[PDB]
From a paper:
The 26S proteasome is composed of a 20S catalytic core particle (CP), to the ends of which two 19S regulatory particles (RPs) are attached. The cylindrical shape is formed by four stacked heptameric rings, with the two inner ones composed of β-subunits and two outer ones of α-subunits. The multicatalytic properties of this proteolytic machine are provided by the subunits β1, β2, and β5. All active CP subunits are initially synthesized in a precursor form with N-terminal propeptides (β1pro, β2pro, and β5pro) that are autocatalytically processed upon CP formation.
The pool of proteasomal complexes isolated via the FLAG-6xHis-tag purification on the β4-subunit also contained pre1−1CP-Blm10 complexes in sufficient amounts for 3D reconstruction. The copurified complex was resolved to 2.4 Å and represents the first structurally characterized native Blm10–proteasome complex isolated from yeast cells. In contrast to previous reconstituted structures, Blm10 caps only one end of the CP in the pre1−1CP-Blm10 complex, reflecting a low abundance of Blm10 in vivo. Similar to the pre1−1CP structure, the proteolytically active subunits in the pre1−1CP-Blm10 are all autocatalytically cleaved and no propeptide remnants or Ump1 is encased inside the complex. The Blm10-bound α-ring in the pre1−1CP-Blm10 structure is in an open-gate conformation similar to already-reported RP-bound CPs and the crystal structure of the reconstituted complex. In comparison, the other α-ring in the pre1−1CP-Blm10 structure, which is not capped with Blm10, resembles a closed-gate conformation. An overlay with the wt 20S CP structure shows that the α3-subunit is poorly resolved compared with the other subunits in the pre1−1CP-Blm10 map, implying high flexibility in this area. We conclude that this effect is mainly caused by the association of Blm10 with the pre1−1CP. Furthermore, α4 and α5 are slightly shifted away from the ring centre. We hypothesize that Blm10 binding to one side of the mature CP primes the α-ring of the opposite side to bind activators.
Numbering used by the authors:
A (entry chain J): 5 to 205
B (entry chain B): 18 to 250
C (entry chain G): 7 to 56, 58 to 76, 81 to 135, 151 to 208, 212 to 246
D (entry chain H): 1 to 196
E (entry chain C): 17 to 244
F (entry chain A): 12 to 251
G (entry chain F): 1 to 49, 51 to 138, 141 to 233
H (entry chain D): 18 to 45, 48 to 127
Write the structure that this text describes.
């Protein structure tokens, strides 16, 4: 882990969520790709994975497999909480052989309508927070920026600015991140994806 | 004719049992048979809880049902729970039970189970549901149904009685009338076993402090409640 | 139809395969066991066919230095009992008690009556796996005369019998049982006094004395 | 830990301290190191707590099965079971056990299973980290036949010295007496044995 | 060298419900008839005879339900395995051949009853476009333009042969399927509660929404518009 | 095939378990189990016609655990097999769950084993009844009976054997008269006397100290009475 | 006519307690040729007498199991091969683990134990060969039947009109029992015994095989120009 | 019988002809129905690999298994010996597979 | 725990025209102590074949016993074929390579 770089941050607003990530992929100091997206979505739930890129791709494929089978069997899209439990169980199934990843789940429950964000450790310990979740090689800078900037009950327009500023300023202080950023603003029925202009790229 | 037809005959020779689904719940009812006053009826249960929201009743060979209840309880945790952190919906649990019965039918050197199951349950995004599982391994949803010995007359009465606006109390009343019309011996609260899948009961959870955690929807009526209901017939 | 395979219950609730095994047991030679004061004596008849060495055809066997016992079925049972006794000794560091050994043998024999894929034993511990404690035990072709003699001995000795006289009584009973047919006698001993509680074969002068006493009777 | 078991005229007496330490910190000060594996067969455990507890539970299960099948096991049988468990898994266990019991053999019986799984039968045995300081004393104040009160006093003096000179031993002194009358449990507090 | 078990399975299928699949120049239409009625049996058993294997392939069933469920679960697992392995949707022919091989294996080894189920596959891929297949217990799969399985196979085949064109539209195929079913059922008239419908069509925008399974209200509206 | 193996007959029957019910009566021994307010009594016939037998080794009563006892009707090999299995299960339960196995749980385990025997073709049923008795920590005096068909249930009182019908009828009449579910006798000796008197009245015969076998379950443990205790109980009965 | 309902498998008892398959396996020995076994106090010999046609060789009847023990067979050849291989393995184990030559009585016990397993298994078949085992020095002689029985005899004969040899041995027991120190005379006595079992058939250097083992004499097989009565 | 009935089932299959010449080999369909799509049709002549081709006669479903096994064996031989399979080796492998399937009961 | 040891000794095999010679020490030692002053190292396995394994005494004894057992079973299975010296060498090579990853710690001269 910590050889490819990458940072993801999720925040909860008023009837909406935001999830942003960097785009750098590299082999230690050398930069390889500036288009390596680390955010995926199944149904209406979004997942960001930091750490080893191979494990990120493997987990994305496995979770797409499981979510498609779930939709076929239950005739219903999976909710963020059930997906969080599934991810935690899958991560714990690899005890002593863990995937070197940091996962973060975001989304709005279709039925209840409230936002939901959560994070996972190496072996699938669920960390549910009502304000923000951070992951990556710049987690300390992300924690500082989120603690300084975040406010409860933010409109999507203000939430986008807050999360973008936090991500950009955290990435500018990390050597293994900052080759482009992408932000998802997720509402009850509409999702907006935006690319950010930043230095070093 | 094969082993499945013989198991169906054995089911037809068993005690009746019923099942009625209303708009806001499901009612299961059956009669306990023990032609021995020395034996204690309370030690034997014919309605078994599978999950806090799913219960089952049977007609046929008792020991087979006793083994199948334990198998279903184990499979409700091994397969769905401990993965998604919640109890399975009624359809998936019924499918797993039908898979168990199908494997019993198809396995060599093993005879099929001689029971038919009526499974009642509730789940989110699907409401209340009632299903019947045959010894072969095929399950069918029902609005109101009966099995066992006097199943033909019970089915006729249910067809003449069931409608779309039926409520839980009306379903209980109809089930009690159907049981009374075909009771083999003695019709009182100690010989009737009735359960309902309905509203969540916070007083049966056992603890307080978690607002999201709700009580079970399965509720087994006591002898006193059954006697009070019979006093209203 | 019910008697053509093992582990099949007849309409009255019987396993005719075990009954046929008992019939096979009833065709065997006589074996006698006498429970004296602090000891047991075993006696065996051995038919002579011809060119046969008169001394080495031993039918008596010992388990764990302190237990005495279709010949190949009996050999198989004795081997399994020896394995069980060795397992008990290794687990608990003490010689296996006689009731424990009998219970393990009974369980092993009853195992061979549960499946139609195996044949019940045809030895004597009955072929059904049943067993009990006895003051005197008789099996074989001439078992009824031996049972009558043992009942006579029990009536005549309400306070117990000595091992030394029990050997001679066993020899006499064996000769009386063989009297029906028209042979060698093997005797084995296990007593707390003359053997210190270890199973032994009684031969030499005492064997000759027992043979002479039986012949004079 | 300081553990001992001594045979006297009416049976056997087991004594132990009540201190369990994680490094230099006392995790438990009311530990009960006297474990019952049969109605009149008890064991004293030293070493790893998990290993000793697991071995005691397995021995208790085996002895219960033996009682169900055969009757009343002897103390030598329990010692043999302990020896088998310790010797088969010597590479993954750290347990020193003293097995003391009263039966028809009379005068009590004591067996020792030290590290490695060996078996030694002794009139009296001491074990634990605190026993090293009370060896010579116990060799100068032991007699083959003693009464109950004298044996209790001997145990109290030995364990008092062991607690005094060993920092890994402390707390209250717990004693178990196994006689034909049954099982007796005795507690001696620091205000009592710190003087005599 | 006839196979008696396969013949028995085919005879059993001949007594099952009738399914019709019609392929047009811009879509595929699947229809099925519900036969079981008890005045108390629930009709919300998800979809009784029409099933989705993925976002691109659908199947119509004629025969025993348990074998159908087993085969459909296996097909779904195979499709997801292909998607995970190659990051692309599985071609229809590959999945059809996989299921046909499973059936053939079940018709060769002793101790296994052949699957008494007939499948009608309707799929779409970028190699051949729209594809329609039929698979039987014998293990053979055949492509078709308009096919029917179940009870009145011969009459439905004749009716389709009379009134099929190579350039029909999706609505034309829907009307043809409805009229063919209405003229072959032994229940006088065709009703919405006894019918299951599905369409696989691609619009002007390359979205490929191949999951349109008709609701009972939609089936009733289509029947009213057609005039059945 | 349907007559020799455990499969359904065209009438939906099981003509290998009913034969086991027939085999349960190979012996001619009648057993009676009653329960007091703080005890449970089991009495069984003991027949030793042979003079070469050792009467001490003839018994149909087993001590499964400290508090649970069992009485078996049927052949002794199956009885001892079931007793060994029950003892092993009780020991395993104690090792696993850390507390003593209840009587009803053991009966349910044995009934499930019997059901497994009935459902698998290569295994034959055991022709035994396996009446378990105990004084439960939560329930109290409890009697639970099984059968080769896998069916088990608890009883206030029960009787087994070829002549069980008369004993059952007398018990039913007595419990109808008393209108209570047990026998009102604080001491278990009185309960044993009542059971012996009931068996004498039902069978219409007298017993000596060598014609009966008694087992008593209390809160402390379950134990089998010796011949001298049976003789003293018979003397106490004869005194009134 | 007279159909037997209890001779199908080896796991069914006759109503009188018989095992017909075991008896048939015993009768299978009569198919094989004649083998004769003697025993003195210092030596033991075996004499064995088939040829498919004039252009074929002769079947081997004597098999060496170790340097001090051997056997002869009558009946099914593959069963004899399996039993001889098992006995060789047992002797090898005894010589390797304990450096101890296996006793003949223990070998007979092992053969009986192995043969017993085929009479109770179902789906198999009992052995169809009878064996004559001879050992070192005192000298020993065993007769093994497929039923699982050993005898420890002075002498015997098995297979294909062997009753004449057996009667001759019963007559001349006291004569041949004490020919200690002269193996050749014991061999000649065995030759006369096997000649007593021949219906006018002659003995040549192609049909006769001999085996000898005694004190200071390892197990030795004579065939060909070595059985010319030299 | 089992082999004879298999041969009878073979006799009901579509005709197939194979001819060899000086430097070439020539390998030689029923009447399709009016509603049958022939755009996607499994050709009766399946190439096992770039130099060996196969043509079946009999049951098509059972021939698919043989074709798949032959292709897998050819690829395995190519990966194991670096040399593409010969004609006789592949024919012997197919014959061995069929002979193995004839035994062990062999209903078909 | 070290499963290997050294016991000293030396052996010498010389092949002539119609004869062979295998000579060896008789001293068995451990470190600086003499275990035995007379322990033969050269044996006679039969068929005019002599083999000596020098080094670890336990491995040498095991190899000698295994080779003699192989020779006796070869005589059993091939009608006393009188195993040749080159065949014996090949068989010993197979025996030694059988324990490729737990090798005999000996030097063999035949």
């Amino acid at each position: 882990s910590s050889i490819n770089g990458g940072i993801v941050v999720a925040m909860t607003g008023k009837d909406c969520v935001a999830i942003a990530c960097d785009l750098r992929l590299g082999s230690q100091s050398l930069g390889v790709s500036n288009k390596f997206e680390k955010i995926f979505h199944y149904g209406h739930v979004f997942l960001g994975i930091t750490g080893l890129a191979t494990d990120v791709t493997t987990l994305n494929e496995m979770f797409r497999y499981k979510t498609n089978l779930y939709k076929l069997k239950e005739e219903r899209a999976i909710e963020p909480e059930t997906f969080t439990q599934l991810v935690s169980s899958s991560l714990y199934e690899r005890r002593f052989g863990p995937y070197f990843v940091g996962p973060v789940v975001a989304g709005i429950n279709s039925k209840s309508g409230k936002p939901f964000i959560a994070g996972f450790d190496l072996i699938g310990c669920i960390d549910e927070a009502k304000d923000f979740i951070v992951s990556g090689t710049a987690s300390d800078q992300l924690f500082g920026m989120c603690e300084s900037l975040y406010e409860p009950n933010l409109e999507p327009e203000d939430l986008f600015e807050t999360i973008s500023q936090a991500l950009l300023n955290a990435a500018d202080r990390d050597a293994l991140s900052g080759w482009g950023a992408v932000v998802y603003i997720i509402k009850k029925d509409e999702v907006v994806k935006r690319y950010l202009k930043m230095r070093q790229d | 004719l094969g082993q499945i037809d013989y198991a169906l005959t054995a089911v037809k020779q068993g005690v009746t049992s019923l099942g009625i689904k209303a708009t806001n719940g499901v009612v299961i009812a059956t009669e306990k048979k023990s032609s021995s006053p020395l034996a204690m009826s309370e030690t034997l249960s014919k309605v078994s809880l599978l999950t806090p929201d799913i219960g089952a009743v049977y007609s046929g060979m008792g020991p087979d049902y006793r083994v199948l209840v334990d198998k279903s309880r184990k499979v409700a945790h091994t397969s769905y729970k401990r993965i998604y952190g919640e109890y399975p919906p009624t359809k998936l649990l019924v499918s797993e039970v039908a898979k168990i019965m199908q494997e019993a039918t198809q396995s060599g050197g093993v005879r099929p189970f001689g029971v038919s199951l009526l499974i009642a349950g509730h789940d989110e995004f699907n409401g209340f549901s009632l299903y019947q599982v045959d010894p072969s391994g095929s399950y069918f949803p029902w609005k109101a149904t009966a099995i066992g010995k006097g199943s033909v007359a019970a089915k006729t009465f249910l067809e003449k009685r069931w409608n779309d606006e039926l409520e839980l109390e009306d379903a209980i009343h109809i089930a009690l009338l159907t049981l009374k019309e075909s009771v083999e011996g003695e019709f009182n609260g100690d010989t009737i076993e009735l359960a309902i899948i309905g509203d969540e009961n916070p007083d049966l959870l056992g603890y307080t402090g978690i607002p999201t955690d709700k009580g079970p929807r399965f509720r087994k009526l006591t002898s006193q409640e059954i006697n009070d209901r019979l006093e209203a017939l | 139809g019910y008697d053509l395979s093992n582990s099949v219950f007849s309409p009255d609730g019987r396993n005719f395969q075990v009954e046929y095994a008992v019939k096979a047991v009833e065709n065997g030679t006589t074996s006698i066991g006498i429970k004296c004061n602090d000891g047991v004596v075993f006696a065996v008849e051995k038919l002579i066919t011809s060119l046969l060495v008169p001394q080495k055809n031993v039918k008596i066997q010992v388990v764990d230095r302190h237990i005495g016992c279709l010949i190949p079925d009996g050999r198989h049972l004795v081997n399994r009992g020896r394995e069980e006794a060795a397992s008990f000794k290794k687990l608990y560091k003490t010689p296996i008690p006689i009731p424990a050994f009998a219970d393990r043998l009974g369980q092993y024999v009853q195992a061979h009556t549960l499946y139609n894929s195996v044949r019940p034993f045809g030895v004597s511990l009955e072929p059904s796996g049943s067993y009990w404690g006895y003051k005197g035990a008789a099996t074989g072709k001439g078992r009824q005369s031996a049972k009558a003699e043992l009942e006579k001995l029990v009536d005549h000795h309400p306070e117990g019998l000595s091992a030394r006289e029990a050997v001679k009584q066993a020899a006499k009973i064996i000769y009386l049982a063989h009297e029906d047919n028209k042979f060698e006698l093997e005797i084995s001993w296990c007593s707390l006094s003359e053997t210190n509680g270890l199973h032994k074969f009684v031969k030499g002068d005492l064997l000759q004395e027992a043979i002479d006493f039986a012949q004079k009777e | 830990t300081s553990i001992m078991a001594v045979t006297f005229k009416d049976g056997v007496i087991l004594g132990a301290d009540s201190r369990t330490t994680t490094g230099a910190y006392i995790a438990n000060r009311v530990t009960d190191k006297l474990t019952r594996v049969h109605d009149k067969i008890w064991c004293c455990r030293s070493g790893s707590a998990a290993d000793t507890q697991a071995i005691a539970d397995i021995v208790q299960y085996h002895l219960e099965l033996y009682t169900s099948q055969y009757g009343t096991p002897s103390t030598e049988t329990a010692a043999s079971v302990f020896k088998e468990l310790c010797y088969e898994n010597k590479d993954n266990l750290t347990a020193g056990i003293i097995v003391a019991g009263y039966d028809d053999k009379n005068k009590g019986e004591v067996y020792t299973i030290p590290l490695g799984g060996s078996v030694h039968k002794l009139p009296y045995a001491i074990a634990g980290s605190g026993s090293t300081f009370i060896y010579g004393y116990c060799d100068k104040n032991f007699r083959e036949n003693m009464s109950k009160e004298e044996t209790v006093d001997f145990i109290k003096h030995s364990l008092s010295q062991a607690i005094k000179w060993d920092g890994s031993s402390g707390g209250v002194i717990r004693m178990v007496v196994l006689t034909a009358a049954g099982v007796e449990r005795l507690i001696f507090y620091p205000d009592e044995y710190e003087q005599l | 060298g006839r196979l008696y078990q396969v013949e028995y399975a085919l005879e059993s299928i001949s007594h099952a419900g009738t399914a019709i699949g019609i392929m047009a120049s811009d879509g595929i239409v699947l229809a099925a008839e519900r036969k079981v009625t008890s005045t108390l049996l629930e009709q919300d058993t998800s979809t009784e005879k029409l099933y989705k294997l993925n976002d691109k392939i659908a199947v119509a069933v004629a025969g025993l339900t348990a074998d159908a469920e087993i085969l459909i679960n296996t097909a779904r697992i195979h499709a997801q395995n292909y998607l995970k392995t190659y990051n692309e949707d599985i071609p229809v022919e590959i999945l059809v051949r996989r299921l046909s091989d499973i059936k053939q294996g079940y018709t060769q080894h002793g101790g296994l009853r052949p699957f008494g189920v007939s499948f009608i596959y309707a799929g779409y891929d970028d190699r051949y476009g729209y594809q329609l297949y039929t698979s039987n217990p014998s293990g053979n799969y055949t492509g078709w333009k308009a096919i029917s399985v179940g009870a009145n196979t011969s009459a439905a085949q004749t009716l389709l042969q009379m009134d099929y064109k190579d350039d029909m539209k999706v609505d034309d195929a829907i009307e043809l399927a409805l009229k063919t079913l209405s003229k072959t059922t032994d229940s006088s008239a065709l009703t919405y509660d006894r019918l299951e419908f599905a369409t696989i069509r691609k619009g002007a925008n390359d979205g490929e929404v191949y999951q349109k399974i008709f609701k009972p209200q939609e089936i009733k509206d289509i029947l009213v518009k057609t005039g059945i | 095939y349907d007559r020799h193996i455990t499969i359904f007959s065209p009438e939906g029957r099981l003509y290998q378990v009913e034969y086991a019910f027939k085999a349960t009566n190979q012996t001619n021994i009648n057993s009676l189990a009653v329960r007091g307010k703080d005890c449970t009594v089991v009495i069984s016939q003991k027949k030793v016609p042979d003079k070469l037998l050792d009467p001490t080794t003839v018994s149909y009563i087993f001590c499964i655990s400290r508090t649970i006892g069992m009485v078996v009707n049927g052949p002794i090999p199956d009885a001892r097999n079931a007793a060994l299995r029950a003892k092993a299960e009780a020991a395993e339960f104690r090792y696993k769950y850390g507390y003593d196995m209840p009587c009803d749980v053991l009966a349910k385990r044995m009934a499930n084993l019997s059901q497994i025997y009935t459902q698998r073709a290569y295994m034959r049923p055991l022709g035994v009844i396996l009446t378990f008795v105990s004084v439960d920590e939560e329930l109290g005096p409890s009697i639970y009976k099984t059968d080769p068909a896998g069916y088990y249930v608890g009883y206030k009182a029960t009787a087994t054997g070829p002549k069980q019908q008369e004993i059952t009828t007398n018990l039913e009449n007595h419990f109808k008269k008393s209108k209570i579910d047990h026998i009102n006798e604080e001491s278990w000796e009185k309960v044993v006397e009542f059971a012996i008197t009931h068996m004498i009245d039902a069978l219409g015969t007298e017993f000596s100290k060598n014609d009966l076998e008694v087992g008593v379950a209390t809160k402390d443990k379950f134990f089998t009475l010796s011949a001298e205790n049976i003789e003293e109980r018979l003397v106490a009965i004869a005194e009134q | 006519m007279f159909r037997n309902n209890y001779d199908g498998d080896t796991v069914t008892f006759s109503p009188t307690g018989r095992l017909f398959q075991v008896e048939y396996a015993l009768e299978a020995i009569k198919q094989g040729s004649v083998t004769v076994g003697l025993r003195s106090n210092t030596h033991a010999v075996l004499v064995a007498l088939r040829n498919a046609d004039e252009l074929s060789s002769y079947q081997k009847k004597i098999i060496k199991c170790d340097e001090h023990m051997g056997l002869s067979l009558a009946g099914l050849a593959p069963d004899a091969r399996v039993l001889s291989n098992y006995l060789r393995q047992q002797c090898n184990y005894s010589s390797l683990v304990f450096n101890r030559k296996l006793a003949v009585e223990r070998a007979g016990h092992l053969l009986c134990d192995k043969a017993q397993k085929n009479t109770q298994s179902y789906g198999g078949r009992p052995y169809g060969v009878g064996l004559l085992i001879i050992g070192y020095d005192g000298a020993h002689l065993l007769e093994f039947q497929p039923s699982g029985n050993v005898t420890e005899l002075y002498g015997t004969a098995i297979g294909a009109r062997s009753q004449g040899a057996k009667t001759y041995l019963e007559r001349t027991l006291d004569t041949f029992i004490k020919i200690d120190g002269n193996p050749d005379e014991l061999i000649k006595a065995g030759v006369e015994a096997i000649s007593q079992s021949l219906r006018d058939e002659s003995l040549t250097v192609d049909n006769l095989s001999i085996a000898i083992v005694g004190k200071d004499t390892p197990f030795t097989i004579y065939d060909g120009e070595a059985v010319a009565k030299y | 019988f089992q082999v004879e009935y298999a041969l009878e089932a073979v006799k009901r299959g579509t005709c197939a002809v194979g001819v060899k010449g000086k430097n070439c080999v020539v390998l030689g369909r029923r009447s399709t129905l009016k509603l049958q799509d022939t755009r996607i049709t499994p050709s009766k002549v399946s190439k096992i690999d770039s130099h060996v081709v196969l043509s079946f006669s009999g049951l098509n479903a059972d021939s698919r298994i043989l074709i798949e096994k032959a292709r897998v064996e050819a690829q395995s031989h190519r990966l194991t010996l670096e040399d593409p399979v010969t004609v006789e080796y592949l024919t012997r492998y197919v014959a061995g597979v069929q002979q193995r399937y004839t035994q062990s009961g062999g209903v078909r | 725990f070290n499963p290997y040891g050294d016991n000293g000794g030396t052996i010498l095999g010389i092949a002539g025209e119609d004869f062979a010679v295998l000579a060896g020490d008789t001293r068995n030692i451990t470190d600086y102590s003499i275990n035995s002053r007379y322990e033969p190292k050269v044996f006679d396995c039969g068929d005019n074949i002599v083999m000596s394994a020098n080094g670890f005494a336990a491995d040498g004894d095991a190899l000698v016993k295994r080779f003699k057992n192989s020779v006796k079973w070869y005589h059993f299975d091939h009608n006393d074929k009188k195993l040749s010296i080159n065949s014996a060498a090949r068989n010993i090579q197979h025996l030694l390579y059988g324990k490729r990853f737990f090798p005999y710690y000996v030097h063999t001269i035949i």
